[PDB]
Amino acid sequence: PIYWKATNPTLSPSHLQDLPGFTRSVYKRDHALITPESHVYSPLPDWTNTLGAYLITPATGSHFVMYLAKMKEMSSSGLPPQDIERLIFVVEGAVTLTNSSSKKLTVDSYAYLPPNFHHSLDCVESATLVVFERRYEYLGSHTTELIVGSTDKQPLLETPGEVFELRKLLPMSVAYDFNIHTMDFQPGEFLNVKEVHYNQHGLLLLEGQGIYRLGDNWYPVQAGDVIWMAPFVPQWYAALGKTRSRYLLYKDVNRNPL
Amino acid sequence: PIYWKATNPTLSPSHLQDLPGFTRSVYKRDHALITPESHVYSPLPDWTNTLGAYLITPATGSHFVMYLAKMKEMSSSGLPPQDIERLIFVVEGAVTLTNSSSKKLTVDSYAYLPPNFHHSLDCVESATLVVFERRYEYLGSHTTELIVGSTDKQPLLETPGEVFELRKLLPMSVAYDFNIHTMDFQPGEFLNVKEVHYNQHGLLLLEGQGIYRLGDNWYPVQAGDVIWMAPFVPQWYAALGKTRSRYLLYKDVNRNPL
Amino acid sequence: PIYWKATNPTLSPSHLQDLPGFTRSVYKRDHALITPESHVYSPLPDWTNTLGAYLITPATGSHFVMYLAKMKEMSSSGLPPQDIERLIFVVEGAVTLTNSSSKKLTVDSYAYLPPNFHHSLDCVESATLVVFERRYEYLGSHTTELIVGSTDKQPLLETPGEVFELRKLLPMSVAYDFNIHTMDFQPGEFLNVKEVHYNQHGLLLLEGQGIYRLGDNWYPVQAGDVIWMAPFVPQWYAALGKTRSRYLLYKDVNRNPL
Amino acid sequence: PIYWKATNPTLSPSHLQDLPGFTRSVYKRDHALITPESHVYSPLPDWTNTLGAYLITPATGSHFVMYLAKMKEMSSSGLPPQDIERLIFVVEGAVTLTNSSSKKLTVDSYAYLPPNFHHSLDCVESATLVVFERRYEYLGSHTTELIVGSTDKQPLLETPGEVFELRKLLPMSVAYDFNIHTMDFQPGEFLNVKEVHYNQHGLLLLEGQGIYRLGDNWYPVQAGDVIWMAPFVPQWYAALGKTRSRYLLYKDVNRNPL
Amino acid sequence: PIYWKATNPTLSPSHLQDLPGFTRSVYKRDHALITPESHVYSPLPDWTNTLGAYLITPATGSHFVMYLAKMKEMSSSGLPPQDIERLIFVVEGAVTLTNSSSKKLTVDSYAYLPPNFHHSLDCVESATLVVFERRYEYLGSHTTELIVGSTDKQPLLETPGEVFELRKLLPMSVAYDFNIHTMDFQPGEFLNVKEVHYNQHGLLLLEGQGIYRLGDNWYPVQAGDVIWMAPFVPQWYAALGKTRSRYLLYKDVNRNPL
Amino acid sequence: PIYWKATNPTLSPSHLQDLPGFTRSVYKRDHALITPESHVYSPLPDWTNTLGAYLITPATGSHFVMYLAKMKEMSSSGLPPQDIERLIFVVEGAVTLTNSSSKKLTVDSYAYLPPNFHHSLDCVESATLVVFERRYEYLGSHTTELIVGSTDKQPLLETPGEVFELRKLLPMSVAYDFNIHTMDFQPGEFLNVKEVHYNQHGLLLLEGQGIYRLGDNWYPVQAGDVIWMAPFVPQWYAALGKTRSRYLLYKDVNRNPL
Amino acid sequence: PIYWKATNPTLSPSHLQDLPGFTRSVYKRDHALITPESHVYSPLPDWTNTLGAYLITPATGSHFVMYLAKMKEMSSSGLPPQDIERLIFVVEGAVTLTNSSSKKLTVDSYAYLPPNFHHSLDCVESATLVVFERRYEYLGSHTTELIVGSTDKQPLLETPGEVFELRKLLPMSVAYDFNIHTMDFQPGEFLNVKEVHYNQHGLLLLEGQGIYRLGDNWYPVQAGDVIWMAPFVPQWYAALGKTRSRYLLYKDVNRNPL
Ligand SMILES: [Mn+2]
Ligand SMILES: [Mn+2]
Ligand SMILES: [Mn+2]
Ligand SMILES: [Mn+2]
Ligand SMILES: [Mn+2]
Ligand SMILES: [Mn+2]
Ligand SMILES: [Mn+2]
């Protein structure tokens, strides 16, 4: 299945049961490498029969949350707080979306919901969702709207001076205050620019493995690893191995950095 | 006696009189190990014949306060600020609580007082109080209520994939924005998950000894030690020795982290 | 041309194509060294056919933003939000100011813009500007007005206790919350006071090279480099090579550090 | 099977096939943590069909070698240089030792061959051997001699001030310049003395897991891991889990340190 | 030309002429990264019209030297001291080797001279040689002999557990106490085994670029770079970019490590 | 009792019985701080009924050995290997020495023994001696001779630029390659010279407490502590408390540093 | 007064008289910066009324010594051991050299003495000498001769790709296994090559001031400072201020580094 290793990591939590205290996770001043055996699942408030693990919250200094959601048999989502926009990405399984016709989202499907937009995600079997939420930044008479889609149905964008394959999930229109990029590196390929920008990131490695650099820290990574990149931290990546690398990325945009 | 070493640490301050500047205490970006020889006791404003030593305050980035109150003869407590909730746990001594009847609190006894709830703690001989205070986060029309009890009465809670015995002092209801856990470990037992969560902690080791890991730091701990765990700091623990480990722990709950 | 080595640094990005992930940039808690291989250019909103890269933003804990704007053939600028004073400085090219008259702004020609002071920049061929923005701290009734000039036209001010050549593009009258200094160093010359002050800095080395100190970190620098100095961060410089050193410097002034 | 995890580690090399460059191994000035995914097996000189991995050699600053020997079907050992004493301990399999009769060795069986003592190890199927060799420090006329045994047959020794169960495979008389110990720790138990001695070590954890402290470094460990301890390195261990800990240890003795 | 970048590194020393003191070179306790801007060339004693730069000498704790020799018009080699075996490798130009016979050596050509083997390297126009010298370690009554060849004529050896392409320039027989390896990696390929071995290394990256891990340090590397690996330093490499990586590697062999 | 705190230190091993893995001991590149909880006692070879604890040996790079010998009932010294010179100092108890009119030495007594000078130390009750030993560096004809004495019956020497009070147990004459110093410091006094010399030290604090500086490390110290100072390590000491600091110091002298 | 500050540093020990333990001295693994407050002066053996302080000895990993001899009222210089070569530099004062005729060495005068060569220095008043002593390495049948002279009498030398003015005090002739250079930099100039080589230095900053880079370390240096440079340490210098930088330097040459 697609994204299988993102749910079944080559180095899983159980392979460490005889290494007391060991972990690959790190939380530093400007970034964080959050790995599978550190995930903290607990009932998701307001949700019905769902465990979740918060990987990133503004406690870190971000303006967004990023959490994993384990939905099981007959379990439903619950409305997010007032003025909070939400974005979900099916990483495994299938869930149904409803408010104009019930759309069924399987793997690789995603859905954006404008702040205060009444909806419900219901599941009847399994489903592992990767969700992003943020207190929307109203700007002028500008507003967002319901977006539903599939990665593959998104066109390959131009990447001046880069070789990775880029696909954006939400519209690039000024309304949206963040977008979800899908980036792919073939084995050996890497980022030419050593980005240093006020933007901030939260990412999930869906396929492959490689080396990710943050500040003066170099980290080996595998499918399933999660990373938080705080504004202005030097970032870089290289894809390694026989298979390609794909990571889901959150990026804030269309707003004055003041 | 119950919690005797918590009040009489094996390695005491006087023991260090011949080691200028020496301390086991460490205050870092996302945590802190606060030890006895560093406690700063000063009279608690609005209290009677009660010496207090604050160990954690929002100055650290937390949203709660943690302090020890050494109540001597004919001592009494003072009401907390407006909208501030309070919780006291008796480590040593006896103290009566009034408001609906009148409860006598001894070692292992505790009491949660809702925000703006009138009450008074009065000590005849002496009492040692470990208390947490916080600005209550009102969630709709929910409100808390007086809670009284003692650890030895709270049922053992099972936690999946873990081996430590757990007890929760307060109700798990949505109205409470924090709970106090009691965690026990037999010598040799440890946390299977190396937690990284949005939740923040404040902890006190009542009995036992062991190794506490915070981020990339490892600290030997003995009863009486206090720890501050900021959000997302990697945390782990292992119980060592002949006797068991037991620690009181604050944990924020039921509120959207966004 | 003057400042040419800023637009074209000796050690330029392409010279690093065969050093995967290699970078001279550093982002620490109290300072930052942003180099050319890390600039992230994205289309500046409200501007016309122009790429821009933010180098400093409040996310760093500053009260100001500093960015590079690469104006191309037939381009114009956008107005900043409300109460955002703006200063621009031409490091290369030419661009006409407009709105009260119309100045042909070229290399070394800067233009201040009071808050909400409507104005516009337009370029027919090509221009590169280093612009600073920040929410003006309204002091009493005092207010600002348009200012336009050139680096070589400003006076050489005395520098008590120091040897570098000092200039200030903007007035010192308390109406201005920030000032932009010009500093010249002859090979072998260095700052005499290991400054430690509340003021914050953002700087671009316009000409030359030398060693820059920040806290306990020492960085070799060349023209085109950019530095971020947070308050209270120990700073120090020394110019080297056969040619003098010159850097554009932002500095906050005339406002209670309270 | 005895010591099954020592040869089939819970966190094995394969589990790390998707984490490029990752390793739990460390080599520092005064110690080393050598783990499986780092063993370098090469044909052993003078041996027949036997791959070997040197874990420790005098390049480290030690006076002994410690290597692993994978003896496959129909194999035999080779004689060691002149004046080199040898000790072999069987971790997996079986091998016959001939030369005073021939003995069939098995897991837990060990043989010590004095310097220049003709012998031959002949394996028919498989056998894993941990061996130590050293340029014997002759002392006067005393001379060591053939010693063939089995851990279990060895008696437990009194270790004043410690709770671990100790055994020594070789005699304690002056001729021997080193001894091999078998140290057992029950969960929760740990060393009381934070050892700092001139004696150097080489160890292999056969069963269990725990934390090993070396200087200011703390390492989680599991059966299979190997430690190099240089003279005078602060050392400490703690056993953890459900199962007990057992490590093989080399120790130089009976020779004036000056 | 073959190995061009190796002769003219992408990031050449001149490119850094405006960065006083800057360098990619590192010299640590158990390894080193020697780069072009650090090459110290000097008249090589006993040679004629040849500049030499020693990169590694036993002062590092190695048992061999490694240097680049810049032979100019009408130049000739100098004999190595008694018992000093020598191996040369041509990375640029051409030189002749006389005295048994005479071979014309171009790029990729090499010659191993046994200890005390009289010879001579005469170059007409110019050539660049990376040469290795070591005091030969006599074992019993074995002796090495002249070996001359070409990397390409050498056969691809089996690399069990790895995917890279391996070639060995000298015989693997007992007489040789070291061999020089040629290792090729296609982009995205890396070492599966994170080596920790007593063998020490001398390395020159002839083609490609990538990331090298030495202990807990990561280094971006390019053609022309040189690395020193002391015994037991954890090592790892991953090739990145469009073209493959190739590196010359010295390795000590066939001698007992005690 | 004299030097009582040296034998029974304020902070003692048993005070840390609940602090798993904790120690004040440090073993670095240029120095060491060996504290009581790290002392490793084992039967001293040839000695009778005595347990020794080597604190310093050549393995550290020193040219001497320093150890504490604890002699019990009917105990006696043993002879040091050939050509070795021995110095003893009784810190607790009583020992008699013979071989010419025997002698009895009590706390604060001592005796130097020329290389190969036959002698015997006979104790009844018990005594704890701190002893040094080295391979005497013969300076041609020069020879050493037996010595007996007591710190207090030894003259106070000059100490220009230094406020402390000194005493040298051995004669400064050329035939002696080392002496033992006694340095007293009064609360608040400290070494004015921030030493960096070829000499090497072994220092046991007998009285007082304070702060010793070694390189960039600052170590709080208490009577009983022991320090290893390698050549050229920046050293320093300041005394604190109500009492005075007093330590026994080894210093190599009278030999060419070549 | 030529070389005044070298004898009376701008930052003096007495200035640090109220900074307990402070020192600018650094002694690391591969290098060292020794400053004025750390010099340990003690009576030089075999000398007459001369206080000497050893700055660098083979204990550092050097093959030479470098000390300062303070010659007072009627003082003589003791003879070096057998086979030890010796060079002397008069930093200040006056001393007379006699074996073949008398020689009056004054500030800037130097004399090199071959091994086993007989000579004597005699001082009436004061004289500060910086001397280097080394066991001579006999190559073939070459022998060195006695050399005497002054810096400015020495010719300027070609400094390819460099700008500092060079001068050598000894013959580059093969017989000599070391030389002493005089290097001058103007304020602002610096080394282009960030040197990494087998040669080992021992320098004295005679005039000027600037920044010295050793490894990843940056040290502000002043006249009077001393530096030990072990083989292969990355090194670099920059002169600064109004006067010029001038430093004396040791460097081993003409010997195979095997
Ligand atoms: Mn980015
Ligand atoms: Mn927790
Ligand atoms: Mn400033
Ligand atoms: Mn031990
Ligand atoms: Mn290797
Ligand atoms: Mn000293
Ligand atoms: Mn040099």
Side-chain angles (χ1 to χ4, degrees), chain A residues 18-44:
Chain A
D18 285 342
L19 278 175
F22 189 88
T23 172
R24 291 168 52 239
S25 304
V26 155
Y27 168 51
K28 298 204 175 74
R29 191 188 62 76
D30 51 14
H31 70 265
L33 175 54
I34 311 170
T35 60
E37 79 294 319
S38 287
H39 290 179
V40 174
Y41 292 103
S42 69
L44 216 41

mmCIF file of all heavy atoms in Angstrom, chain A residues 18-44:
data_model
loop_
_atom_site.group_PDB
_atom_site.id
_atom_site.type_symbol
_atom_site.label_atom_id
_atom_site.label_comp_id
_atom_site.label_asym_id
_atom_site.label_seq_id
_atom_site.Cartn_x
_atom_site.Cartn_y
_atom_site.Cartn_z
ATOM 1 N N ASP A 18 14.250 -3.130 24.248
ATOM 2 C CA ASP A 18 15.363 -3.507 25.115
ATOM 3 C C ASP A 18 16.426 -2.430 25.193
ATOM 4 O O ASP A 18 17.569 -2.710 25.510
ATOM 5 C CB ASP A 18 16.016 -4.816 24.662
ATOM 6 C CG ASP A 18 15.187 -6.033 25.005
ATOM 7 O OD1 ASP A 18 14.289 -5.944 25.865
ATOM 8 O OD2 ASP A 18 15.455 -7.096 24.420
ATOM 9 N N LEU A 19 16.046 -1.200 24.885
ATOM 10 C CA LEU A 19 16.954 -0.063 24.961
ATOM 11 C C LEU A 19 16.263 1.007 25.796
ATOM 12 O O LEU A 19 15.639 1.924 25.266
ATOM 13 C CB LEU A 19 17.286 0.478 23.568
ATOM 14 C CG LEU A 19 18.385 -0.245 22.775
ATOM 15 C CD1 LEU A 19 18.486 0.345 21.391
ATOM 16 C CD2 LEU A 19 19.726 -0.129 23.503
ATOM 17 N N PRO A 20 16.365 0.893 27.127
ATOM 18 C CA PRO A 20 15.762 1.819 28.085
ATOM 19 C C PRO A 20 16.139 3.274 27.877
ATOM 20 O O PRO A 20 17.303 3.638 27.988
ATOM 21 C CB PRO A 20 16.257 1.290 29.427
ATOM 22 C CG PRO A 20 16.443 -0.157 29.169
ATOM 23 C CD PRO A 20 17.115 -0.156 27.836
ATOM 24 N N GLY A 21 15.140 4.101 27.582
ATOM 25 C CA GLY A 21 15.376 5.519 27.386
ATOM 26 C C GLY A 21 15.806 5.959 25.998
ATOM 27 O O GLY A 21 15.844 7.151 25.730
ATOM 28 N N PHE A 22 16.125 5.021 25.114
ATOM 29 C CA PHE A 22 16.562 5.380 23.774
ATOM 30 C C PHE A 22 15.469 6.012 22.919
ATOM 31 O O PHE A 22 14.301 5.630 22.981
ATOM 32 C CB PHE A 22 17.114 4.158 23.024
ATOM 33 C CG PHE A 22 17.781 4.501 21.703
ATOM 34 C CD1 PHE A 22 19.139 4.829 21.652
ATOM 35 C CD2 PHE A 22 17.044 4.553 20.525
ATOM 36 C CE1 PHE A 22 19.744 5.208 20.448
ATOM 37 C CE2 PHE A 22 17.641 4.930 19.325
ATOM 38 C CZ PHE A 22 18.993 5.258 19.288
ATOM 39 N N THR A 23 15.870 6.983 22.112
ATOM 40 C CA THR A 23 14.953 7.642 21.204
ATOM 41 C C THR A 23 15.698 8.525 20.222
ATOM 42 O O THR A 23 16.754 9.056 20.526
ATOM 43 C CB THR A 23 13.904 8.494 21.953
ATOM 44 O OG1 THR A 23 13.163 9.265 21.003
ATOM 45 C CG2 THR A 23 14.568 9.429 22.947
ATOM 46 N N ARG A 24 15.130 8.679 19.037
ATOM 47 C CA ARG A 24 15.722 9.511 18.002
ATOM 48 C C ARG A 24 15.140 10.921 18.035
ATOM 49 O O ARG A 24 15.630 11.807 17.346
ATOM 50 C CB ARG A 24 15.477 8.881 16.636
ATOM 51 C CG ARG A 24 16.243 7.582 16.394
ATOM 52 C CD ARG A 24 15.729 6.870 15.166
ATOM 53 N NE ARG A 24 15.708 7.774 14.027
ATOM 54 C CZ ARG A 24 14.620 8.083 13.329
ATOM 55 N NH1 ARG A 24 13.446 7.556 13.644
ATOM 56 N NH2 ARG A 24 14.712 8.930 12.318
ATOM 57 N N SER A 25 14.102 11.123 18.843
ATOM 58 C CA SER A 25 13.447 12.424 18.954
ATOM 59 C C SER A 25 14.296 13.489 19.634
ATOM 60 O O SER A 25 15.027 13.221 20.578
ATOM 61 C CB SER A 25 12.123 12.307 19.703
ATOM 62 O OG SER A 25 11.271 11.372 19.094
ATOM 63 N N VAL A 26 14.163 14.706 19.135
ATOM 64 C CA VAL A 26 14.887 15.848 19.640
ATOM 65 C C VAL A 26 13.990 17.078 19.583
ATOM 66 O O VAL A 26 13.245 17.273 18.626
ATOM 67 C CB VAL A 26 16.139 16.132 18.776
ATOM 68 C CG1 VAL A 26 16.529 17.599 18.887
ATOM 69 C CG2 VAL A 26 17.292 15.241 19.210
ATOM 70 N N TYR A 27 14.056 17.899 20.620
ATOM 71 C CA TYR A 27 13.287 19.132 20.654
ATOM 72 C C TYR A 27 14.302 20.204 20.964
ATOM 73 O O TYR A 27 14.824 20.256 22.059
ATOM 74 C CB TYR A 27 12.225 19.095 21.747
ATOM 75 C CG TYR A 27 11.586 20.448 22.043
ATOM 76 C CD1 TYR A 27 11.071 21.243 21.008
ATOM 77 C CD2 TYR A 27 11.477 20.927 23.365
ATOM 78 C CE1 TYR A 27 10.465 22.484 21.282
ATOM 79 C CE2 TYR A 27 10.874 22.162 23.649
ATOM 80 C CZ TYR A 27 10.370 22.941 22.601
ATOM 81 O OH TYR A 27 9.795 24.175 22.846
ATOM 82 N N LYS A 28 14.617 21.046 19.997
ATOM 83 C CA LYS A 28 15.584 22.087 20.267
ATOM 84 C C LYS A 28 14.914 23.440 20.113
ATOM 85 O O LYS A 28 13.710 23.525 19.879
ATOM 86 C CB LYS A 28 16.808 21.958 19.342
ATOM 87 C CG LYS A 28 17.604 20.653 19.514
ATOM 88 C CD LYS A 28 19.063 20.817 19.047
ATOM 89 C CE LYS A 28 19.952 19.584 19.316
ATOM 90 N NZ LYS A 28 19.718 18.403 18.401
ATOM 91 N N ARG A 29 15.706 24.493 20.259
ATOM 92 C CA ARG A 29 15.233 25.865 20.158
ATOM 93 C C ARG A 29 14.517 26.245 18.855
ATOM 94 O O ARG A 29 13.486 26.897 18.896
ATOM 95 C CB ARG A 29 16.413 26.813 20.388
ATOM 96 C CG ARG A 29 16.026 28.274 20.564
ATOM 97 C CD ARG A 29 17.250 29.157 20.579
ATOM 98 N NE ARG A 29 17.945 29.055 19.307
ATOM 99 C CZ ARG A 29 17.540 29.641 18.184
ATOM 100 N NH1 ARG A 29 16.433 30.397 18.181
ATOM 101 N NH2 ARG A 29 18.228 29.441 17.062
ATOM 102 N N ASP A 30 15.054 25.846 17.703
ATOM 103 C CA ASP A 30 14.440 26.209 16.424
ATOM 104 C C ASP A 30 13.895 25.090 15.554
ATOM 105 O O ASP A 30 13.534 25.326 14.402
ATOM 106 C CB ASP A 30 15.409 27.047 15.579
ATOM 107 C CG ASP A 30 16.789 26.413 15.446
ATOM 108 O OD1 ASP A 30 16.954 25.220 15.764
ATOM 109 O OD2 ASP A 30 17.715 27.125 15.010
ATOM 110 N N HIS A 31 13.831 23.877 16.085
ATOM 111 C CA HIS A 31 13.314 22.758 15.312
ATOM 112 C C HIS A 31 13.095 21.560 16.194
ATOM 113 O O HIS A 31 13.431 21.586 17.380
ATOM 114 C CB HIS A 31 14.285 22.363 14.201
ATOM 115 C CG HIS A 31 15.541 21.716 14.696
ATOM 116 N ND1 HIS A 31 16.704 22.420 14.927
ATOM 117 C CD2 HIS A 31 15.810 20.431 15.031
ATOM 118 C CE1 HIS A 31 17.629 21.598 15.385
ATOM 119 N NE2 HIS A 31 17.114 20.385 15.456
ATOM 120 N N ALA A 32 12.560 20.500 15.603
ATOM 121 C CA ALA A 32 12.308 19.279 16.336
ATOM 122 C C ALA A 32 12.203 18.062 15.434
ATOM 123 O O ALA A 32 11.599 18.107 14.378
ATOM 124 C CB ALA A 32 11.026 19.419 17.156
ATOM 125 N N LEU A 33 12.814 16.971 15.857
ATOM 126 C CA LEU A 33 12.727 15.725 15.124
ATOM 127 C C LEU A 33 11.945 14.784 16.042
ATOM 128 O O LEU A 33 12.458 14.298 17.044
ATOM 129 C CB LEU A 33 14.116 15.161 14.820
ATOM 130 C CG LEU A 33 14.023 13.787 14.152
ATOM 131 C CD1 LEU A 33 13.143 13.857 12.922
ATOM 132 C CD2 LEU A 33 15.390 13.310 13.808
ATOM 133 N N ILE A 34 10.688 14.565 15.681
ATOM 134 C CA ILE A 34 9.760 13.735 16.431
ATOM 135 C C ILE A 34 9.571 12.386 15.750
ATOM 136 O O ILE A 34 8.995 12.292 14.668
ATOM 137 C CB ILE A 34 8.410 14.474 16.542
ATOM 138 C CG1 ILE A 34 8.678 15.909 17.011
ATOM 139 C CG2 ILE A 34 7.466 13.733 17.487
ATOM 140 C CD1 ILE A 34 7.499 16.832 16.944
ATOM 141 N N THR A 35 10.048 11.334 16.398
ATOM 142 C CA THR A 35 9.958 10.001 15.843
ATOM 143 C C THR A 35 8.888 9.119 16.498
ATOM 144 O O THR A 35 8.537 9.307 17.649
ATOM 145 C CB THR A 35 11.322 9.331 15.911
ATOM 146 O OG1 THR A 35 11.755 9.255 17.271
ATOM 147 C CG2 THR A 35 12.323 10.137 15.122
ATOM 148 N N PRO A 36 8.371 8.129 15.753
ATOM 149 C CA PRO A 36 7.337 7.161 16.131
ATOM 150 C C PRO A 36 7.276 6.632 17.555
ATOM 151 O O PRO A 36 6.188 6.463 18.105
ATOM 152 C CB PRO A 36 7.549 6.046 15.128
ATOM 153 C CG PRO A 36 7.930 6.788 13.924
ATOM 154 C CD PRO A 36 8.928 7.777 14.436
ATOM 155 N N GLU A 37 8.418 6.359 18.170
ATOM 156 C CA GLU A 37 8.357 5.824 19.514
ATOM 157 C C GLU A 37 8.210 6.876 20.606
ATOM 158 O O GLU A 37 8.357 6.559 21.784
ATOM 159 C CB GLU A 37 9.560 4.918 19.806
ATOM 160 C CG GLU A 37 10.862 5.618 20.157
ATOM 161 C CD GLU A 37 11.414 6.405 19.006
ATOM 162 O OE1 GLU A 37 11.368 5.905 17.868
ATOM 163 O OE2 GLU A 37 11.914 7.517 19.236
ATOM 164 N N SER A 38 7.906 8.115 20.219
ATOM 165 C CA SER A 38 7.712 9.203 21.178
ATOM 166 C C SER A 38 6.288 9.730 21.124
ATOM 167 O O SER A 38 5.865 10.497 21.992
ATOM 168 C CB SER A 38 8.686 10.349 20.905
ATOM 169 O OG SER A 38 9.992 9.995 21.300
ATOM 170 N N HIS A 39 5.564 9.309 20.092
ATOM 171 C CA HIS A 39 4.187 9.719 19.893
ATOM 172 C C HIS A 39 3.404 9.473 21.170
ATOM 173 O O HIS A 39 3.568 8.454 21.803
ATOM 174 C CB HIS A 39 3.545 8.924 18.738
ATOM 175 C CG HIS A 39 4.076 9.267 17.377
ATOM 176 N ND1 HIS A 39 3.634 8.645 16.229
ATOM 177 C CD2 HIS A 39 5.007 10.168 16.977
ATOM 178 C CE1 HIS A 39 4.268 9.145 15.183
ATOM 179 N NE2 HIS A 39 5.106 10.072 15.608
ATOM 180 N N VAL A 40 2.556 10.417 21.550
ATOM 181 C CA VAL A 40 1.754 10.260 22.751
ATOM 182 C C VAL A 40 0.270 10.287 22.392
ATOM 183 O O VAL A 40 -0.322 11.351 22.294
ATOM 184 C CB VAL A 40 2.066 11.374 23.771
ATOM 185 C CG1 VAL A 40 1.133 11.279 24.948
ATOM 186 C CG2 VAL A 40 3.487 11.256 24.232
ATOM 187 N N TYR A 41 -0.320 9.108 22.195
ATOM 188 C CA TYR A 41 -1.734 8.998 21.836
ATOM 189 C C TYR A 41 -2.642 9.033 23.054
ATOM 190 O O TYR A 41 -2.390 8.361 24.057
ATOM 191 C CB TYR A 41 -2.006 7.714 21.046
ATOM 192 C CG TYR A 41 -1.385 7.687 19.669
ATOM 193 C CD1 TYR A 41 -0.231 6.956 19.432
ATOM 194 C CD2 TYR A 41 -1.927 8.422 18.610
ATOM 195 C CE1 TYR A 41 0.378 6.956 18.197
ATOM 196 C CE2 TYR A 41 -1.318 8.427 17.348
ATOM 197 C CZ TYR A 41 -0.160 7.692 17.155
ATOM 198 O OH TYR A 41 0.505 7.697 15.950
ATOM 199 N N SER A 42 -3.702 9.826 22.949
ATOM 200 C CA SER A 42 -4.669 9.982 24.018
ATOM 201 C C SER A 42 -5.969 10.464 23.403
ATOM 202 O O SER A 42 -5.962 11.165 22.395
ATOM 203 C CB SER A 42 -4.169 11.009 25.042
ATOM 204 O OG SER A 42 -4.165 12.324 24.503
ATOM 205 N N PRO A 43 -7.107 10.097 24.004
ATOM 206 C CA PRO A 43 -8.410 10.512 23.482
ATOM 207 C C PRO A 43 -8.410 11.947 22.978
ATOM 208 O O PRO A 43 -7.942 12.859 23.648
ATOM 209 C CB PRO A 43 -9.328 10.309 24.678
ATOM 210 C CG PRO A 43 -8.754 9.076 25.299
ATOM 211 C CD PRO A 43 -7.263 9.355 25.267
ATOM 212 N N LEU A 44 -8.926 12.149 21.777
ATOM 213 C CA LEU A 44 -8.977 13.482 21.223
ATOM 214 C C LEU A 44 -10.252 14.179 21.729
ATOM 215 O O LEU A 44 -11.373 13.701 21.517
ATOM 216 C CB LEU A 44 -8.970 13.389 19.706
ATOM 217 C CG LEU A 44 -8.215 14.449 18.918
ATOM 218 C CD1 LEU A 44 -6.894 14.791 19.579
ATOM 219 C CD2 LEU A 44 -7.991 13.903 17.528
#
